[PDB]
Amino acid sequence: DAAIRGNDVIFVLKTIGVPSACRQNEDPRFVEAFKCDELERYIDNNPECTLFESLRDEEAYSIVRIFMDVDLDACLDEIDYLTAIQDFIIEVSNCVARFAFTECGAIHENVIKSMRSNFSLTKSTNRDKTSFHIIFLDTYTTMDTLIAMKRTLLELSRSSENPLTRSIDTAVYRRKTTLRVVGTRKNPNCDTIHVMQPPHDNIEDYLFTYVDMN
Amino acid sequence: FISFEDAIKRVSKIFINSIINFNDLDENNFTTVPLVIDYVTPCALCKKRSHKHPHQLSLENGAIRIYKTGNPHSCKVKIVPLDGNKLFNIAQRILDTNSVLLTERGDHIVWINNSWKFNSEEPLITKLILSIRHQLPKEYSSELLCPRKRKTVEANIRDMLVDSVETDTYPDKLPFKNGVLDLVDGMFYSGDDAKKYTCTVSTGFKFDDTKFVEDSPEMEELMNIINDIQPLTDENKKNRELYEKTLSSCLCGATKGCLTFFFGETATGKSTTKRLLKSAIGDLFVETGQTILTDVLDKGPNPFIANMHLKRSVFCSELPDFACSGSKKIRSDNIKKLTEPCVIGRPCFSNKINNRNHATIIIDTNYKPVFDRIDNALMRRIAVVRFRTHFSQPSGREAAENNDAYDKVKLLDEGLDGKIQNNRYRFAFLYLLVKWYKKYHIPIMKLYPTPEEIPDFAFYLKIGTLLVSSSVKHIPLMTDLSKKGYILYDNVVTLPLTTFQQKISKYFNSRLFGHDIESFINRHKKFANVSDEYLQYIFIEDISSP
Amino acid sequence: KRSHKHPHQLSLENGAIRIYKTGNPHSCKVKIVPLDGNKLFNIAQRILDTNSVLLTERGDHIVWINNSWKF
Numbered sequence A: 001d002a003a004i005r006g007n008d009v010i011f012v013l014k015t016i017g018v019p020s021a022c023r024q025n026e027d028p029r030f031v032e033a034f035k036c037d038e039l040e041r042y043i044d045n046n047p048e049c050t051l052f053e054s055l056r057d058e059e060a061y062s063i064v065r066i067f068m069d070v071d072l073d074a075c076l077d078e079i080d081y082l083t084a085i086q087d088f089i090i091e092v093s094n095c096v097a098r099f100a101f102t103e104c105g106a107i108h109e110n111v112i113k114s115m116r117s118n119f120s121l122t123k124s125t126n127r128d129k130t131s132f133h134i135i136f137l138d139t140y141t142t143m144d145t146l147i148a149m150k151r152t153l154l155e156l157s158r159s160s161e162n163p164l165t166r167s168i169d170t171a172v173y174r175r176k177t178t179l180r181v182v183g184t185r186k187n188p189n190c191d192t193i194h195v196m197q198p199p200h201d202n203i204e205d206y207l208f209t210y211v212d213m214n
Numbered sequence B: 001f002i003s004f005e006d007a008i009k010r011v012s013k014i015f016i017n018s019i020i021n022f023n024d025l026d027e028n029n030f031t032t033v034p035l036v037i038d039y040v041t042p043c044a045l046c047k048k049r050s051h052k053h054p055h056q057l058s059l060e061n062g063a064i065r066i067y068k069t070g071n072p073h074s075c076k077v078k079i080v081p082l083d084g085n086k087l088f089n090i091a092q093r094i095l096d097t098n099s100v101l102l103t104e105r106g107d108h109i110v111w112i113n114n115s116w117k118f119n120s121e122e123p124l125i126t127k128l129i130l131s132i133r134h135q136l137p138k139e140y141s142s143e144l145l146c147p148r149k150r151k152t153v154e155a156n157i158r159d160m161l162v163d164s165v166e167t168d169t170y171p172d173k174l175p176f177k178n179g180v181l182d183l184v185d186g187m188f189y190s191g192d193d194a195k196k197y198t199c200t201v202s203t204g205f206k207f208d209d210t211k212f213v214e215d216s217p218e219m220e221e222l223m224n225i226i227n228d229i230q231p232l233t234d235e236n237k238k239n240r241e242l243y244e245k246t247l248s249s250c251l252c253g254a255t256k257g258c259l260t261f262f263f264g265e266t267a268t269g270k271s272t273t274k275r276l277l278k279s280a281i282g283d284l285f286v287e288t289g290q291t292i293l294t295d296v297l298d299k300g301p302n303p304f305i306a307n308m309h310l311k312r313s314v315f316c317s318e319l320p321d322f323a324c325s326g327s328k329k330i331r332s333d334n335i336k337k338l339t340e341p342c343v344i345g346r347p348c349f350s351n352k353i354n355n356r357n358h359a360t361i362i363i364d365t366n367y368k369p370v371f372d373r374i375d376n377a378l379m380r381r382i383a384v385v386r387f388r389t390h391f392s393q394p395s396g397r398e399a400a401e402n403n404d405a406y407d408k409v410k411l412l413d414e415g416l417d418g419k420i421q422n423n424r425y426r427f428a429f430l431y432l433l434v435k436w437y438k439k440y441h442i443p444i445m446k447l448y449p450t451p452e453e454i455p456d457f458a459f460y461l462k463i464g465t466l467l468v469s470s471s472v473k474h475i476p477l478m479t480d481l482s483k484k485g486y487i488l489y490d491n492v493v494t495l496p497l498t499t500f501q502q503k504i505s506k507y508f509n510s511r512l513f514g515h516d517i518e519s520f521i522n523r524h525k526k527f528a529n530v531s532d533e534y535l536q537y538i539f540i541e542d543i544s545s546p
Numbered sequence C: 001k002r003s004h005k006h007p008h009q010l011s012l013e014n015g016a017i018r019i020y021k022t023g024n025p026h027s028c029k030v031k032i033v034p035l036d037g038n039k040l041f042n043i044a045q046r047i048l049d050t051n052s053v054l055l056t057e058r059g060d061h062i063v064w065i066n067n068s069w070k071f
């Protein structure tokens, strides 16, 4: 299949709402392509930038990681946070494994163990809000698979009871989707950004477009 | 969406204390007006005492969130769902984990105690629910405690299953009570990893890694016993190799196309090997009667074939002598039928007429085997292993040494026995079997016939070597056959019957060859005219260009 | 981990017992314990604790009545 094909170039949008023609012509202001070290250096030089991660050609290369977004407008203590996050990760891993077995035809056990092996988490500087993005490094699939799965995720969110499981946004599974780069300003006049976590210290582990099978 | 009254009832039951702002709540401003709780008792969310601030309700994602104004850490957040049967959600969650499946045979298989349990008259679904209770969030265990709710969840699970899945598709896996052993590398899976391969059978005993060790005194004793039964000499090198191959083939779950004969005079240790194998693989070993080799299978029920299903080793012992009176010759059709991937047979009070064949069939005998009809098809579906080592009491030491059957006599030791029935060499034998399987069968597993033995076959083996079929290519030497005296009447090298018997008499002694000679006569009988009893054959020994 | 240098701590909330490590909770895992539920389930567990009823291989159940295993 892909084999040698492993994504390492980072395609980035420097402004929300990019005009279509400028994207087609590869404008140097709203569209750019860096490497991991290049992107890190660019972020370091300009802390006021606003960058969004997205794919460029979905008809040629269509391999990505699994990414999810959670946003809930309430703060909570530590122990409850850990209990809720472990319950949520167990539930979502089970749901994805069941979908993979039922439709994709893969192996439930391998999928669930790969999903539960390694996962990346973020945090928000907001005091009264809890939002994060979860990216699974050891799981790979195409965009249309996630688009199909969005229904199962929506019913999972509606049926469940855990506060963050109710806060899963299924709208991100859309054609020409975008994701904000961690540690980058969302608005030009907004100081709310995403902070890092002790388990991982590399940007490579927090990008869903990075494809490197092991 | 549900009626507003039901939501108000739920939110009023969640708050143990009453609400003094009950009347002012309406369908248009239920998310704007703060509500006042009379604090005579601590609130349900957080105990504390007499919260000094009111609460508020918000609607999002079809759910009602309760939050207290002020410091967020003072009170806990509560979420009220809109609709959705809780039992249905629990059933979906349980079905998600792939712990229960439906097979092609119309039965349900569950996964508990690291084993694929399977029954047709028991409610294994309820046991699975009760066991899996722990993995679910704590708000579901209380519901799962009641039996009626368990029955409802089981009904939902039954309604949610529509497809069938194949079972036992891996021929190189050995299932145990607490895991699956991989015959390729010899490393033993456990826990969930064994659930990947759907194996509905098991050896019946748990697997222990402590005794699965190459070096142990029990291993040395087993090696000594094996050497005593089968010496490692140059003569029986092929015999010992065939013995090892046949023993190792009992682990593979594929289909075997040969039958092995354990031929030996008496007290040669065949029962010892059978009991060791039984102690090794457990219940995958099944002993059956001789009826299959003597009767037909289609008519009436046949519970033996029903029990043969999916077994990996079948043993038929104590073969009666066919030389004596009342003999029933072995049915060649049964032999040809027993080497097929599917065997047709019906159980008692049933309709299934197909069974999977994964069994290595081993027949223990004391005398020579006798069949009714012999053909080339039978010669490719038979094999034999010769057992020549006596184990006798020194009281009959000389009584056995004079015998020409036994080749080496040893002391009959009253040891073993119970120890073998005590599984003293259970795990020791598995290591040797796995080693032999790696030595022989890993690239391609396939058995091979041994037509050279079974002297009843020998005549039929000789004729093909001795006789050749006349054809047009024997025309250019019509002089040579004219030397023999044959004729080209009907454009074929004829052979008078008188000439044929006078020819074969000087090379074959007939009598015991007479019956099969006559069978050859009638089977290949050709009458060109009323009285020209010619044959379509050429003797290669004397008509090798004479 | 090694030796759990920070002592553990027990809490009660919503009829549920919680176990968590003091100091840095991220260095350990929180455990949950339930409360007593149905009286009938507790009675069944108490009865089963005495090993007075056993299940055989043939799918039948044997009981211990009048100082004799009845099947």
Ligand SMILES: Nc1ncnc2c1ncn2[C@@H]1O[C@H](COP(=O)(O)OP(=O)(O)O)[C@@H](O)[C@H]1O
Pocket (backbone or CB within 6 Å): B224, B225, B226, B228, B229, B264, B265, B266, B267, B268, B269, B270, B271, B272, B273, B391, B411, B412, B413, B414, B415, B416, B417
């Ligand atoms: N290597 C050995 N060491 C000790 N005893 C042996 C050995 N080989 C055979 N025997 C004894 O010889 C007897 C042979 O019995 P059995 O297996 O029924 O032979 P057969 O099947 O030929 O009658 C067994 O009871 C066994 O105890």
